[PDB]
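Re-run requested by the PI after the first attempt was lost when the workstation crashed. Everything re-entered from the original request form. Ligand of interest: magnesium ion.
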Amino acid sequence: PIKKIISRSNSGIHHSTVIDYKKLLTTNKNKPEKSLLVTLKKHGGRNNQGKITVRHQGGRNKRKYRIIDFKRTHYDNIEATVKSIEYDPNRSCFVSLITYANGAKSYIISPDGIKVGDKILASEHPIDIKPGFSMPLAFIPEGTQVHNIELHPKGGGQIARSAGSYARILGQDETGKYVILQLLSGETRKFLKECRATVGVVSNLDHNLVVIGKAGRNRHRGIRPTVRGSAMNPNDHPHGGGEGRSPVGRDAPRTPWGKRHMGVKTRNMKKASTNLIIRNRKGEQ
Amino acid sequence: MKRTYQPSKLKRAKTHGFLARMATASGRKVLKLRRKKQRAQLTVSSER
Amino acid sequence: DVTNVLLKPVLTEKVYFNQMGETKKYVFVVNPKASKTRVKLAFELVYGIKPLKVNTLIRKPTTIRGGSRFPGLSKLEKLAVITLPKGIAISVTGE
Amino acid sequence: SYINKPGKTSAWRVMTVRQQVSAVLAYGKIETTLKKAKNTQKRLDKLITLAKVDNFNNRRQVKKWLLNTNLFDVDQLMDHLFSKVAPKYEKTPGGYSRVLKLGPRRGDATEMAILQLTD
RNA sequence: UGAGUAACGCUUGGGAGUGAGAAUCUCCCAAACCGAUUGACUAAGGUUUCCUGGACCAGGGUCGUCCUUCCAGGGUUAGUCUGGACCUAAGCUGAGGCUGAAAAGCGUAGGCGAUGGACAACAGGUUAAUAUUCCUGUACUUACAGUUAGACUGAUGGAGUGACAAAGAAGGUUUUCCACCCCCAUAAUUGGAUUUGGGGAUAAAUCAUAAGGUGGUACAAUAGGCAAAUCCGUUGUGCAUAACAUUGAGUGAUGAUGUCGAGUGAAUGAGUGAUCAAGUAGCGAAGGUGGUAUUAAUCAUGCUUUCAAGAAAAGCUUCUAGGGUUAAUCUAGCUGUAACCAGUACCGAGAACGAACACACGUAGUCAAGGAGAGGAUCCUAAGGUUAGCGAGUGAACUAUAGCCAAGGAACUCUGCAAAUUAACCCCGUAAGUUAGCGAGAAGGGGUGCUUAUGUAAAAGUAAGCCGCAGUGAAGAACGAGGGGGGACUGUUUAACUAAAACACAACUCUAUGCCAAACCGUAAGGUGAUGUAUAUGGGGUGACACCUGCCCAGUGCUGGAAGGU
RNA sequence: AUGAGCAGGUUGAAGGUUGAGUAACAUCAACUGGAGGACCGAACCGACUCUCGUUGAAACGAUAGCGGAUGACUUGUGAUU
Ligand SMILES: [Mg+2]
Ligand SMILES: [Mg+2]
Ligand SMILES: [Mg+2]
Ligand SMILES: [Mg+2]
Ligand SMILES: [Mg+2]
Ligand SMILES: [Mg+2]
Ligand SMILES: [Mg+2]
Ligand SMILES: [Mg+2]
Ligand SMILES: [Mg+2]
Ligand SMILES: [Mg+2]
Ligand SMILES: [Mg+2]
Ligand SMILES: [Mg+2]
Ligand SMILES: [Mg+2]
Ligand SMILES: [Mg+2]
Ligand SMILES: [Mg+2]
Ligand SMILES: [Mg+2]
Ligand SMILES: [Mg+2]
Ligand SMILES: [Mg+2]
Ligand SMILES: [Mg+2]
Ligand SMILES: [Mg+2]
Ligand SMILES: [Mg+2]
Ligand SMILES: [Mg+2]
Ligand SMILES: [Mg+2]
Ligand SMILES: [Mg+2]
Ligand SMILES: [Mg+2]
Ligand SMILES: [Mg+2]
Ligand SMILES: [Mg+2]
Ligand SMILES: [Mg+2]
Ligand SMILES: [Mg+2]
Ligand SMILES: [Mg+2]
Ligand SMILES: [Mg+2]
Ligand SMILES: [Mg+2]
Ligand SMILES: [Mg+2]
Ligand SMILES: [Mg+2]
Ligand SMILES: [Mg+2]
Ligand SMILES: [Mg+2]
Ligand SMILES: [Mg+2]
Ligand SMILES: [Mg+2]
Ligand SMILES: [Mg+2]
Ligand SMILES: [Mg+2]
Ligand SMILES: [Mg+2]
Ligand SMILES: [Mg+2]
Ligand SMILES: [Mg+2]
Ligand SMILES: [Mg+2]
Ligand SMILES: [Mg+2]
Ligand SMILES: [Mg+2]
Ligand SMILES: [Mg+2]
Ligand SMILES: [Mg+2]
Ligand SMILES: [Mg+2]
Ligand SMILES: [Mg+2]
Ligand SMILES: [Mg+2]
Ligand SMILES: [Mg+2]
Ligand SMILES: [Mg+2]
Ligand SMILES: [Mg+2]
Ligand SMILES: [Mg+2]
């Protein structure tokens, strides 16, 4: 759920909204586990050459990266227990500090619906269909929610990692592999049989409805002001110049670097992963 | 007002110093010409 | 050892102020590359009485005879302030 | 033109006459400019004639002009004026002070003047 | 030539002296400004500009016997201060290696890199110039050797700590402050004086005591911590109003028969005298009690709340490994030895720095007095500091800065531009509209001085009386109402003519992107995106909120498409 | 990347506690709590207006007003395009 903010500061009006962080998190305080805590260096949208590469990036607050076990393969056959659900500033989804039977601690992406004290276990056998259990895709019955999908087998988690992200199983293929996966955005892909994934939907399903109320909140989040192309000079942007508010003028909108970019497809179809795609959110292949 | 030159003992030595000029091929070429002109102040290191 | 680190004794108002009242303080000029331990060793091997402690001064070169047709810089000095124990006073000249 | 000097304000003028009158009463001679000597004479003569009765009212009146000098304070200058200087001028019908002109200053060419008590 | 013209860039009077010559130099007395500063300590920078004596070629917007100028001599003392010999952040360099016509670019291990972390000294005195550095007094820290006693020692590795955000409010203890008291000098010819003025201090370190703050404590099993573990982590049990562990401002005793101290105050010698000498040497009394409903500092890296979720390493503790067993190592005590390198002067700015100028500009941090006052606002001063490096006259026109102006009160002008009214505190009262938060200090009014009494811890207030034309009597404090255009708003912008309706902003929508993702820097390696995964990223357009967004797919752009023609 | 600064004074949100109330909610009253791209106003930042200056004190300032002043804030040091 979400909770409104009543500023009552007589400088404009903003119906700001924030996540509750009280009935969804165990302890409201910020007490991350020290061992699995590395600091992140803010690149600021600049590459190794020091030149701005991705615009509108810079000015976020200092954060410390929480080491997340996306692989979840090292401590197989060992029962793990969730102890507390906390807030990770580097991802929209909550992270759970789980502890294994041998005494090892780790952070994993928290499935929605689990509370403190719910047992977890990952391995490469049938196991059980319980929320958070991670097993390979060969044994998942068709229809269940799965997140943290692994593209390369024995690799780490890559698909369905954001808040409220999930995927459905849509049967198999006659090849004996490439289990069918219906992902978000209405795309159907063929994932290898040995690929390992975790069932359950990712927590924080209400991250869509959060409403920023101020420029400063977005600036502190790490977003710099984006200047429209219509306000530019005739140099530095195709949509510049003019005397007053001027239209596009060209045959179609253009990028700052001068490509069409509007409706054109920018996917390299001669890729080894094209044959594993059934639909591309619009049509066949 | 804040004028252009704000003196700093470190910035000057680390930008126009002898070791700074002796770190790139371009720096060696500039030093060669200044030796050719027989400048008494070859670099900013020899301030005194 | 070689004893090139004892160049010249110097006598000023400050030197004579220290060089009276029980413990004597003798101020020499030493090799600018020499260290305190070398100064104590040189004093040991050429006088015979162990210094109680040694203090060092570095006087930076400065412009002298400014405005004269040919201006010149000063010379780098390292000063050493030896202090002998109570009741002992040796002469800098006469051995 | 702005940030000008304060200038020869009325307060400055009153203080200048006050300072000069205290000194000429203490020592007996003042070497000043002629146009400044010609202005201290009025206050000097007025003070002396009012100080001829030597009552406490006259002391309060004189104290608005005297200032501290090197040779006397503000309280012995009172005694010096009222017991030594003023009693001497007991029947002189005015004109106790004289201003005479010296030469020009070397660095200003202004006309100097000596103000003295005429015995 | 202009022309001896403009200008000489914010600060007065006098006495005595030097000198060939003095508004300008020295001394003294005043006077006027600064006093959240023109005062004091330093970082950066400057680089001898610091002290003494001498000089008046040149420089000083005048003068000069004088100077931050010149000449000669002198001046900067560290085991504990600021930095290395310790550690890392952004970043730089980078053997191999990758990439590239060449030069070179990227980059691993290593190595540098403070504006951060760890680390032992305080008080007073002394020279013309240095002082946590020299001296006196009292301490502390780290190494090495010998010795005594005890103990098995335990890292290049593991673990814990180190280790941290913003805002806010309560406490504990010292303070500031108030009252009393102690000590010192003073007793006043201008009317009355029975008083007036000043001071009341001591550190680091050692020992004991500590208000409190922080977090559960032991025992037992262990498969996890590149091997090992008795340490950590995990799982159980017992006891858990507490115990145990760690930390802790302050207090008392030594340090201190010391030092400092208001004031008193010479001798010696110079000199014609005064005066210097000097208000210097020396002497130097008291050096305390209670309160606080007032103050700031510390405990405090304490606590609470919120989301924007808040450095690394060294070091310290611990664990085994590994080494010892007829030993090494460590701990505690005693004795002795040693503690390296660089900086230390002065200015720190209406004259030492950045602005060519002894230029009205600019430059991090730290100490912050009294009265009234919420206040570091405002006026006057304290400690302290300066004499704005051209003066003297006159008081024409004219100019700048101010002050005032009878009657009218915007008639002026492109426009109430500018100027003027209001202004602090307390007590009444406060509309339309609205997103119900605001509007709003709305509008409109009243009181303020002094004395006595009552009130209180202090007040505020209340009642009576008195004076003036006027009583936050001076300084510092919002002019208001109504309608409309634009932008929702707070913000940003053309350094040096345009601050706005322009840009941005929260919000809406379209489009691309399934991860070796699209996009982007390069030639490539490499990298940003992102240590992110469609609730995510990039781009185009619109710009809170509310209601809406109509028709045209002919042309252009984009997507898809069987075959067929080129 | 690492540090530092914002004298002083007001307004009194969310939330929590208690009581009334509800069949139980909702709602109301008191107390606590101290949030705000909140308000007034110094240092600080900025530069909207008049006048002066335009061979200036100054190759962009002075006096008098003026906007922000806990934040999209200001600033020191170091690195980098
Ligand atoms: Mg770490
Ligand atoms: Mg963007
Ligand atoms: Mg434009
Ligand atoms: Mg173009
Ligand atoms: Mg156009
Ligand atoms: Mg048009
Ligand atoms: Mg030294
Ligand atoms: Mg006046
Ligand atoms: Mg000519
Ligand atoms: Mg001429
Ligand atoms: Mg003429
Ligand atoms: Mg003329
Ligand atoms: Mg003139
Ligand atoms: Mg002047
Ligand atoms: Mg003058
Ligand atoms: Mg004053
Ligand atoms: Mg100052
Ligand atoms: Mg010089
Ligand atoms: Mg001097
Ligand atoms: Mg001299
Ligand atoms: Mg001259
Ligand atoms: Mg010492
Ligand atoms: Mg280093
Ligand atoms: Mg440092
Ligand atoms: Mg000094
Ligand atoms: Mg009397
Ligand atoms: Mg192991
Ligand atoms: Mg000093
Ligand atoms: Mg200045
Ligand atoms: Mg200068
Ligand atoms: Mg000047
Ligand atoms: Mg400063
Ligand atoms: Mg004050
Ligand atoms: Mg003031
Ligand atoms: Mg009037
Ligand atoms: Mg009048
Ligand atoms: Mg009138
Ligand atoms: Mg009228
Ligand atoms: Mg007209
Ligand atoms: Mg008209
Ligand atoms: Mg106006
Ligand atoms: Mg209104
Ligand atoms: Mg209209
Ligand atoms: Mg606007
Ligand atoms: Mg604005
Ligand atoms: Mg401009
Ligand atoms: Mg402007
Ligand atoms: Mg590539
Ligand atoms: Mg990355
Ligand atoms: Mg974004
Ligand atoms: Mg627009
Ligand atoms: Mg619009
Ligand atoms: Mg068509
Ligand atoms: Mg087509
Ligand atoms: Mg505000």
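Saved to the shared folder this time. The longest helix of chain B spans residues 25-36.
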